[PDB]
Design a protein around this ligand. Structure first.
Ligand SMILES: C[C@@H](O)[C@@H](C(=O)O)[C@H]1C[C@H](SCCNC=N)C(C(=O)O)=N1
Ligand SMILES: [Zn+2]
Ligand SMILES: [Zn+2]
Length: 228
């Protein structure tokens, strides 16, 4: 792990890093939120912002120092603060941002700044290639409603890494966390769909725990089984 300001960065692969930011909440302590940084050729792709604009600006600052390649785009995985809280920092830097069309629709209602572009998805959950221009190794998949209705997931092609966001919890998790906006009926099936969408992926990255094995997916699905 590397510390940069109030943020932590961990290299997961030759071209993949995890960024970690924290938000303090009275009576619940500091909560970590993870996103991904991917170097693809002569450019950098980012998955999810940090909690805030200032923290997200630091991600860009870290990228400039450690990778020194222009950030081509960013993808945010749903309309909550830990994923889209720092959209302004991205837009201020002239970075093209992408989100589920539903996330952008929900964003103002959630007090979030919408992404500049909208992703749409086929009936099998895979992103419409026309909506995800120049995404490189990023394979975006909508597993169905779970943590939220708009939640999406990202696989990193050429690696053993898949990003489940807040949909997937680690194998040692006791709860599915914030179920405030959750679809308790479909959550389990959505978790399993994610696993099936990236079957060879052996490293599962998620929002609120260190990278885990595929057991995180199964364990999450089985916790969600008890919500039906
Ligand atoms: C405040 C929102 O951004 C919230 C959300 O996206 O629903 C964040 C924080 C909680 S963390 C709840 C328990 N996890 C503790 N590490 C959470 C989650 O459980 O996935 N996501
Ligand atoms: Zn969330
Ligand atoms: Zn979260």
């Amino acid at each position: 792990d590397q510390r940069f300001g109030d943020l932590v960065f961990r290299q997961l692969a030759p071209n993949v890093w995890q960024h970690t930011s924290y938000l303090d909440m009275p009576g619940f302590g500091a909560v970590a939120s993870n996103g991904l940084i991917v170097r693809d050729g002569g450019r950098v792709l980012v998955v999810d912002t940090a909690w805030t604009d200032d923290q997200t600006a630091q991600i860009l600052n870290w990228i400039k120092q450690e990778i020194n390649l222009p950030v081509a785009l960013a993808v945010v995985t749903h309309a909550h603060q830990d994923k889209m809280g720092g959209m302004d920092a991205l837009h201020a830097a002239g970075i093209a941002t992408y989100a589920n069309a539903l996330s952008n629709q929900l964003a103002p209602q959630e007090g979030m700044v919408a992404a500049q572009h909208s992703l749409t998805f086929a009936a099998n959950g895979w992103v419409e290639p026309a909506t995800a221009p120049n995404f490189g190794p990023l394979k975006v998949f909508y597993p169905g409603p779970g943590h939220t209705s708009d939640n999406i997931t990202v696989g990193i092609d050429g690696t053993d890494i898949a990003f489940g966001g807040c949909l997937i919890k680690d194998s040692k998790a006791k709860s599915l966390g914030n179920l405030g906006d959750a679809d308790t009926e479909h959550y389990a099936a959505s978790a399993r769909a994610f696993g099936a969408a990236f079957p060879k992926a052996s490293m599962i990255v998620m929002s609120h725990s260190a990278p885990d094995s595929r057991a995180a997916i199964t364990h999450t699905a089985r916790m969600a089984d008890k919500l039906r």
